[PDB]
């Protein structure tokens, strides 16, 4: 498994970068990246990465999971 907290479901409905901040201060291992779901995503697996997927409003519309 990966170290630290793995998912942040409670941050759904929040703004992307705020979510990124909180996520990063909770898990000292991951680099949080706010990205749009319309965009393209690489298919690798990283324990040091948390995608904060947002829409055209900048709100988190999916659970930020360590992948």
């Amino acid at each position: 498994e990966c170290p630290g907290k793995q998912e942040w479901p409670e941050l759904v409905g929040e703004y992307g970068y705020k979510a990124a901040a909180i996520i990063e201060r909770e898990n000292p291992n991951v680099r949080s990246i706010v990205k749009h779901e319309r965009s393209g995503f690489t298919k690798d697996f990283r324990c040091d990465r948390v995608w904060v997927v947002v829409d055209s409003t900048g709100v988190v519309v999916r659970t930020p999971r360590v992948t």
């Binding site: 319309r38 393209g40 995503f41 690489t42 298919k43 690798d44 697996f45 992948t67």
Partner: protein
């Protein structure tokens, strides 16, 4: 693979697993010393793993060889993901057997509609996360570049091709990168990127290997 099937033990003997403590990317053996993968899986100090079905269980027919050299294509674009391909030299050669074999690089490109085998240890759900103990597989036809450009407007290069279904439901996912996309007995594609997994109107995007046979042949001779 999302929406695939259990291949069985070593149905895909050329499937390799890139390791750094955990399986982070996949790859394909091209000869007893070299492995092709995606350039975005570039790490520092990779351990290539061949002949593995259960990556959480040591079954006995497994080779764990460190990477001595790793080479990214000089024109790899981290932003547009153009030329997402990387060669890897094994520190020492691997014992080729029934469990571990390499795969042939293509003569020509495959045509749209060609049924291809895609394999990997990636995520297996449309939404959420669940990772298999066993290697997963999926058959998928190559799609027209009209459909590939319609799916991804102004993001598809002449070095990319889409595969899967625009119906969605079945597609390669996170952890499948660098994985083999085999057509008619030859390695035609490299699992690259996409938008989520198994999403409608947005299938998988894969590196076109029929464009790099020269560089691949040159890199092993030069390095």
């Amino acid at each position: 693979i999302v929406g695939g099937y259990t291949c069985g033990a070593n149905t895909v003997p050329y499937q390799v697993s890139l390791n750094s403590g955990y399986h982070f990317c996949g790859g394909s053996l091209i000869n007893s010393q070299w492995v092709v993968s995606a350039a975005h899986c570039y790490k520092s100090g990779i351990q290539v793993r061949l002949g593995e079905d259960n990556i959480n269980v040591v079954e006995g027919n497994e080779q764990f060889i460190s990477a001595s050299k790793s080479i990214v294509h000089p024109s790899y674009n981290s932003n547009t993901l153009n030329n997402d391909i990387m060669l890897i030299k094994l520190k020492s050669a691997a014992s080729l057997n029934s469990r571990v074999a390499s795969i042939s690089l293509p003569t020509s490109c495959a045509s749209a509609g060609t049924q291809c085998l895609i394999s990997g240890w990636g995520n297996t759900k449309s939404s959420g996360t669940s990772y298999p103990d066993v290697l997963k597989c999926l058959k998928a036809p190559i799609l027209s570049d009209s459909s590939c450009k319609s799916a991804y407007p102004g993001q598809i290069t002449s070095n990319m091709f889409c595969a899967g279904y625009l119906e969605g439901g079945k597609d390669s996912c996170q952890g499948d990168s660098g994985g083999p996309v085999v057509c008619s007995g030859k390695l035609q594609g490299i699992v690259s990127w996409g938008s989520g997994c198994a999403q409608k109107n947005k299938p998988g995007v894969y590196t076109k290997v029929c464009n790099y046979v020269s560089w691949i042949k040159q890199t092993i001779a030069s390095n």
